[PDB]
Design a protein around this ligand. Structure first.
Ligand SMILES: Nc1nc(=O)c2ncc(C(=O)NCC(=O)N[C@@H](Cc3ccccc3)C(=O)N[C@@H](Cc3ccccc3)C(=O)O)nc2[nH]1
Length: 263
C-alpha cells in the first residue's frame, strides 16, 4: 500500500528522469510544510507507520528489477527488494527497526545487514570514495543488475556497496537537490558517466546543516554562514536561504517554524 514510483534506465532521457524525480518528491512531501518556498519533509514525530515509506521500482535494459524503500522523513534508502529476498541496512534505533518490519512483508528471505547505510560505511566497503565513483545512466543500469544478483553470490560486497552509492545519489540526493538532479540530467542527456565534483559532494555533506540553518534563520538570514564548494573546488559562502531556492528541493525537518511575526 506504500506508494510506488517506477523508473527504468532503459532508453532513459532527461525528460523521463525529470518525471521520475518530480514524482518522488511529490510522494515525499505533503505540502503541509514549506519555508522560504522550500518544502520540508514530514516530521518523524507522530508520523503514522502507514505514511512512513515510499517505494522506488527500478528496472533496466537487462530486464531486471529491484525495489528501493525510502524513508519519507529524510529520503533515506533503508533497504531493497529483489525478487524473493529483501535487504535492510542496520537501523539507527528501535523505532526504525520496527518500522522496517512493515516493508516487503511477504518476501520469503529477509536480511538486515550488520552495517548501516551511510556514505562513510558504504565507501569503506566499496573500497572507493564518492569522488571516485562514476554516476550516470550507465552506472545506474549496472547498479540495478548488481543489486539484483546479490542474493545468489554474483555480486561482491564491494560492488554492492558501490551500487548503493550510485542509487542513493541518483535518487535520494537528486530528490533533495535540484542542483544534483541537474547534474544527473546532464550525464543522462550526453550518456557520459562521471564522478561527482566538489559542488555535488559538499551539497550532499551539508544537507542537514543547510536544512537547520534555513529553518533556524532570521527571516532567511543565517546566523553563521555555511561554506560550500563550487565545481573547481573553490569556496562559496552561503549567508541566506535566497541563493539556495534553485539549489535545494527538500529539507529534513529540524525545528518548528516560528510564529510568523509579521510587521
Ligand atoms: N542508504 C542511504 N540513503 C540515503 O539517502 C543517504 N543519504 C545520505 C547519506 C550520507 O552519508 N550523507 C553524508 C552526510 O554527511 N550526511 C549529512 C546530511 C544528511 C544526509 C542524509 C540524511 C540526513 C542528513 C548528515 O548530517 N549526516 C549525519 C549522519 C546521518 C544521519 C541520518 C541519516 C544519514 C546520515 C551525520 O554526519 O551526523 N547516506 C545515505 N545512505
Amino acid at each position: 500500500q506504500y506508494p510506488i514510483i517506477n523508473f527504468t534506465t532503459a532508453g532513459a532521457t532527461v525528460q523521463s528522469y525529470t518525471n521520475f524525480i518530480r514524482a518522488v518528491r511529490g510522494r515525499l512531501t505533503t505540502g503541509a510544510d514549506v519555508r522560504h518556498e522550500i518544502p520540508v519533509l514530514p516530521n518523524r514525530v507522530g508520523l503514522p507507520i502507514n505514511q512512513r515509506f515510499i517505494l522506488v521500482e527500478l528496472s533496466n535494459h537487462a530486464e531486471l528489477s529491484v525495489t528501493l524503500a525510502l524513508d519519507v522523513t529524510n529520503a533515506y534508502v533503508v533497504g531493497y527488494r529483489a525478487g524473493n529476498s529483501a535487504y535492510f541496512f542496520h537501523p539507527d534505533n528501535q523505532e526504525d527497526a520496527e518500522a522496517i518490519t512493515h516493508l516487503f512483508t511477504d518476501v520469503q528471505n529477509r536480511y538486515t545487514f550488520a552495517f548501516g547505510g551511510n556514505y562513510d560505511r558504504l565507501e569503506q566497503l566499496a573500497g572507493n570514495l564518492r569522488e571516485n565513483i562514476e554516476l550516470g545512466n550507465g552506472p545506474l543500469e549496472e547498479a540495478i543488475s548488481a543489486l539484483y544478483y546479490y542474493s545468489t553470490g554474483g555480486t561482491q560486497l564491494p560492488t554492492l556497496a558501490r551500487s548503493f552509492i550510485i542509487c542513493i545519489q541518483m535518487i535520494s540526493e537528486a530528490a533533495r537537490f535540484q542542483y544534483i538532479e541537474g547534474e544527473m540530467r546532464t550525464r543522462i542527456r550526453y550518456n557520459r558517466r562521471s564522478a561527482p565534483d566538489p559542488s555535488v559532494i559538499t551539497l550532499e555533506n551539508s544537507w542537514g546543516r543547510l536544512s537547520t540553518a534555513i529553518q533556524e534563520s532570521n527571516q532567511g538570514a543565517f546566523a553563521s554562514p555555511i561554506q560550500l564548494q563550487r565545481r573547481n573546488g573553490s569556496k562559496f559562502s552561503v549567508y541566506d536561504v535566497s541563493i539556495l531556492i534553485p539549489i535545494i528541493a527538500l529539507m529534513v525537518y529540524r525545528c518548528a517554524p516560528p510564529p510568523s511575526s509579521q510587521f
